[PDB]
Amino acid sequence: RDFFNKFNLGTSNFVTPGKQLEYVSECKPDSTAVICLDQNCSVITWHQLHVYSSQLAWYLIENEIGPGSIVLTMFPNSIEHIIAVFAIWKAGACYMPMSYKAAESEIREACDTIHPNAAFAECKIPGLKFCLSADEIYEAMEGRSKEMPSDRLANPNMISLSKMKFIRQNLPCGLDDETIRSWSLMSGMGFEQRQLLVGPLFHGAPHSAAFNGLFMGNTLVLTRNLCPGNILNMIKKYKIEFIQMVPTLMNRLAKLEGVGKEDFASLKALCHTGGVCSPWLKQIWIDLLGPEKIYEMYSMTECIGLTCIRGDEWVKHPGSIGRPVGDSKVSIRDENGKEVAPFEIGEIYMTAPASYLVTEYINWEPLEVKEGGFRSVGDIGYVDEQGYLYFSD
């Protein structure tokens, strides 16, 4: 069939990340998949990425890491981290990332709460099935089949950390046409755009951006030095076309001496999420790149909902965080649970996209859900006549 997912050489709509990696590497085996700046630069082709992650999955499989297993991953932003994730998922296991700078008490708390079965880490954690350093993953690979293990689902695919709270994604990793299209409409990401990653891979947003980027055949550029002047140089030098960032980074980049439209001209889309972006900072970026290039996603508290808004809509609805994505709905309600008129202030109830409905805060009791699938955390705001949502405080 002829899929919106242009690499899908197969028969089903839904494709796992490993199968998608296979398809992409068949189409362009020797193009660069990941570029890593460490000054020191390393690269890996789609074909190597595919082959090494398959070899590493066979090692997981021999060690009985699979569905039901949880693999803690504490590599920094590196090729090896990327390989590890694909290998974990190719084996059906659940990926659990944390900072490579996590403190000992946090590692201890995470192990004592989740009880992971293995790990990728530079410092050896006792009592696990294995604990491989970044150098050791190549040794674990040596000798193993270059063919991917037979395709399989990894559910849950991830547990992530935000004293500590753990969020578990009870759905298999991968995407279908509808979810790719929808990701592309909310983020501005298209097919075959060089992406620069400037968030840590253990955060949820940068995780999505990197692996949805690789899923779409985009080359991923990773950097360890997140100094703004450096980031800007990397944008130019690699002709970056897509970048996701937090508002803090947008604020610093806009303040660099000299900067202007021309420095960012390679960009097709800038996506921002994961912190308040003031109207001032938004206007500055709309003026730097053009309003159709600024994409924003606002994920509500506790996953009750997700909105998005593009810069040209934001100029027409200034202050808004967008409209609920896809088939999601928002309902602004008064103190008796009744929906109100446009511009009236009340509690924000929302329905959630598919993926959020099967996302769980571990050891936290879920929210009350009203009829239609509506939840609230008590946020206060309003909608305008076109359904754009605004916060009051």
CA angle 122, 123, 129 (to 5 degrees): 90
**Resolution of the structure in the document, Å:** 2.2
Q: What is the 3-state secondary structure (H, E, C) of the chain?
A: CCCCCCCCCCCCCCECHHHHHHHHHHHCCCCEEEEEECCCEEEEEHHHHHHHHHHHHHHHHHCCCCCCCEEEECCCCCHHHHHHHHHHHHCCCEEEECCCCCCHHHHHHHHHHHCCCEEECCCCCCCCCCEECCCHHHHHHCCCCCCCCCCCCCCCCEEEECCCCEEEECCCCCECHHHHHHHHHHHCCCCCCCEEECCCCCCHHHHHHHHHHHHCCCCEEEECCCCHHHHHHHHHHCCCCEEEECHHHHHHHHHCCCCCHHHHCCCCEEEECCCCCCHHHHHHHHHHHCHHHEEEEEECHHHCCEEEEEHHHHHHCCCCCEEECCCCCEEEECCCCCECCCCCCEEEEECCCHHHHCEEECCCCCCCCECCCEECCCCEEEECCCCCEEECC
Q: Measured between alpha carbons, how far is 258 from 168 in angstroms, rounded to an integer?
A: 44
- Exposed, middle or buried: residue 155 (CB in 10 Å: 0-12, 13-18, 19+)? middle
- The technique is X-ray
Q: What is the dihedral of CA 168, 170, 173, 174, to 10 degrees?
A: -130
Residue with tokens 């000054």: 39
Q: Which stretches of 221-277 are DSSP H helices? A: 228-237, 247-255
For residue 73, list its beta bridge partners.
97, 120
Q: Measured between alpha carbons, how far is 120 from 58 in angstroms, rounded to an integer?
A: 15
**In CATH, what number is assigned to the domain containing residue 44?**
3.40.50.12780
CA angle 116, 176, 179 (to 5 degrees): 90
Strands 323-324 and 380-383: unpaired
Q: Measured between alpha carbons, how far is 104 from 110 in angstroms, rounded to an integer?
A: 10
358 token code pair? 């099967």
Largest CA distance in the chain: 66
What does the DSSP 8-state code read for residue 367? P
What does the DSSP 8-state code read for residue 82? H
Please count the structural domains in the chain.
Answer: 1
Domain range spanning residue 136? Answer: 1-393
